[PDB]
Structure formats: structure tokens, C-alpha cells
Design a binder for this molecule. Structure first.
Ligand SMILES: Oc1ccc(/C=C/c2cc(O)cc(O)c2)cc1
Ligand SMILES: Oc1ccc(/C=C/c2cc(O)cc(O)c2)cc1
Ligand SMILES: [Mg+2]
Ligand SMILES: [Mg+2]
Lengths: 208, 207
């Protein structure tokens, strides 16, 4: 009965339908008019909320980080006493949500496997670059905090370690999406997280 | 001769497919689009490829060729240094990615420009088959390294092959996305050894 609350409901309906449409048919061939029909909204309504498909993809991508922001900011805090432990809790929660939450799984599948970078829609690649650079900045600081607190080797190259951890986690998530019944990500989640952290703690190649 | 002409036509089609897929992506490119870009007519592309998924697979299969010698060596139970063969394999994989325009662009197509959205689902099915085949070979090569004492005796060879694939595949994709951020060629030894150190040293990878 109020403008803002009805707008928020319509926006959520559009995003939910976009996840269903992109997951089934992919981003390239899905139109906003298609998503409007699936959502039960008018074309005027969808173009009111989103200028183009790139803005809907970004809404999906930006929706992933809210769950973990509390543990991420803690790991990045220069006053946090256990930054490596916050990083481990962050990685456990990432994997747990991926396996358990149908929405998170479907969005990750869309971004990994149903969404092309093409220069006719250059914003998709540009916004993915910004998201990964932002993650890298956070993890570089979290790992530097861990080194200062004696939880990681003193000569750790924090930048390269953050890249190595991102490579491993992102590669494991994509492998699981491709071949889920191949790897028990939920049952062995602690093992999978600790494999990545062990690389950072123990590999001499990651020292300066 | 018919045989040499058909081989040249196939190569012309595959080269045009790389150009077309890189520019416009796989989803919206048809075989008819690729044939026009290749200068190939009278329906010849359909004599070479049953559908677009087969052309994607041809690009994917072309990546194995350079590395086959080192991969088979690493998997041979007669090889004396199966971990060293795997190291040389990963060095070449990263070197070719940075140096070879064709390998780089094919990887960019498969990682970033190729939706799992075809009718017969063959694009996803063949990617699954390809990764399972890599996994089978890497599990064998790591099991050979364990047998030679080059990796821990209690290593979970299957999980270690998954962890190494995750790291390597993730690092390649990370580099394709942000090439100015990772000196893949300059520090290639460090990047390869970081991954091999994970398998050699992580207790989480032991049974
Ligand atoms: O494949 C993936 C690779 C990396 C990540 C990281 C997510 C993440 C989420 C946060 O809230 C803070 C952060 O610093 C990182 C998620 C998935
Ligand atoms: O990210 C990756 C990029 C390339 C590869 C190649 C693996 C490979 C496996 C084989 O059995 C034979 C071969 O010639 C290559 C694996 C992972
Ligand atoms: Mg969430
Ligand atoms: Mg090659």
C-alpha cells in the first residue's frame, strides 16, 4: 500500500525470476522482457528497476557477499586477535552456504557457467574484475593481519598468498558446480578449507 | 587431393570458430556464422562438424596436444621422476598460456565465453568428461609419485588431484580476468611450486 514497499517486493520478484531464467537459458539469450513475463510484472516495471541485463547480473553478484561480510570485516580488523581463524570461519561459511542454499548455488552456477564476457556487454567482465579485486584487497589485509599476529610465516608474500588462496577456493567451487557428486564439499568441508590454508602456512614458494 | 583439402578446410573452420567465439561468445554464434567468417561455402561446415558443441570440443581437445608427452610420462609406472614430469607439465601449461595467443584465446573462450546452454547439454557433458579425464591422469601421476616416495605415503591421491586442479584452474582463470595483476610468466616457478607444495606438505590431504 506504500510506494517503497511495493517497489521492494517487485524488485525481489524480478531478481528471483532472473535467477530462474538465467539458470535455465543463460544470460546471453535471456531478455528483460523474458524475465518480466516470468516474474509476472510489466516491461515498464522491469526497465524501471534495471536499465539492462548487466544491472541484473550485478544485482545477483552483489547479493552474494552480505552473508559473509561480518566475518570478512573481522578478519580485516587490525585489532582482531584471531584473523586467520576469522578467515577459516569465513571459508567454512562460504562452502556451507554454497552446498546448502539453492539460491547461492544457482547464482554461482550462473556466474561461472551461464554468463559470457562479450564486448557488446563489457560491464559484465568489468564488474567481475572489480569484485575480485575487492576480495583480493580484503584477503591481502586479512593475511597480513595473520602474519603480524604470528599465525602465518613472517616472510609470507601476502599479495601472492591471497592470489593463491583465491585461485584454490574459486577453482574448487567451480569444480564442485561442474562435478558435484565427485567431491563431498559438505561432509569434508573442514578438510577442503584446511587444505587451502595449509598451502599458505607451509609452502616456501609463497615466502618473499 | 581430397584428404589434404579437407584437412585445410577443417583448420580454416576451427580458426574462424576461435575468432567468432572470442568476439561474440559461443551461445549466440551458429555454425552458419562461422562458415561465413571462414569463407567456406556449399554447407561444408556441416560435413566437418555435426553441431556447435563438436566445434567447442575440437577447441578443447586442441589444448592437450602440446602437453601430451609430459602427461603420459608422468602417468607411466616406468617413469623415474613422475613429480618432476608433473612440474614440467605445469610449467609448460602456464608458459604456453602467456606466450601463445591461440592457447590464451581458447582458454578465454572456454572459461569466460561459453555458456552451458545447448539443447543436448553436450557442452557441459563434454566439459565434465574432460575434467574427469584430467583427474584420472593426475590421480595416476600423483599415485606414481607416492610410490616413488616423492609425495607422502598416506596422501589421498584422489583428493590431492582435485586440490591441484582447483588451484591450477583457478589461477588460470584469475590470470585471464586480471592479467596485469599476476606475473604468471615472470614467477612461473613460484606459481607451480606453490601448488605442488600444497600436495607435498598439507596434512589435510593425507588419509
Ligand atoms: O569462489 C569464490 C572465491 C572467493 C570468494 C570470496 C568471497 C568473499 C566474501 C566476503 O564477504 C568477503 C570476502 O573478502 C570474500 C567467494 C567465492
Ligand atoms: O587448468 C588446466 C589446464 C590444462 C590442463 C592439462 C592437463 C593435461 C592432462 C593430460 O592427461 C594430458 C595433457 O596433455 C594435459 C589441466 C588443467
Ligand atoms: Mg548469501
Ligand atoms: Mg598447445
Amino acid at each position: 500500500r506504500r510506494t517503497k514497499e511495493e517497489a521492494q517486493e517487485t524488485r525481489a520478484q524480478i531478481i528471483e525470476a532472473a535467477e530462474r531464467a538465467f539458470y535455465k537459458r543463460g544470460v546471453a539469450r535471456t531478455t528483460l522482457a523474458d524475465i518480466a513475463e516470468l516474474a509476472g510484472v510489466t516491461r515498464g516495471a522491469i526497465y524501471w528497476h534495471f536499465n539492462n541485463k548487466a544491472e541484473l547480473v550485478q544485482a545477483l553478484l552483489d547479493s552474494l557477499h552480505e552473508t559473509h561480510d561480518h566475518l570478512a570485516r573481522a578478519s580485516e580488523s587490525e585489532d582482531e586477535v584471531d584473523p586467520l581463524g576469522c578467515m577459516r570461519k569465513l571459508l567454512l561459511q562460504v562452502f556451507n552456504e554454497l552446498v546448502l542454499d539453492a539460491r547461492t548455488r544457482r547464482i554461482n552456477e550462473i556466474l561461472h557457467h551461464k554468463c559470457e564476457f562479450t564486448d557488446d556487454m563489457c560491464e559484465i567482465r568489468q564488474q567481475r574484475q572489480s569484485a575480485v579485486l575487492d576480495i583480493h584487497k580484503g584477503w591481502t589485509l586479512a593475511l597480513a593481519n595473520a602474519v603480524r599476529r604470528g599465525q602465518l610465516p613472517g616472510e609470507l608474500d601476502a599479495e601472492r598468498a591471497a592470489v593463491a588462496l583465491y585461485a584454490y577456493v574459486d577453482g574448487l567451487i567451480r569444480r564442485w558446480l561442474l562435478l558435484p557428486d565427485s567431491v563431498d564439499l559438505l561432509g569434508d568441508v573442514e578438510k577442503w578449507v584446511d587444505t587451502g590454508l595449509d598451502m599458505l602456512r607451509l609452502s616456501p614458494a609463497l615466502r618473499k
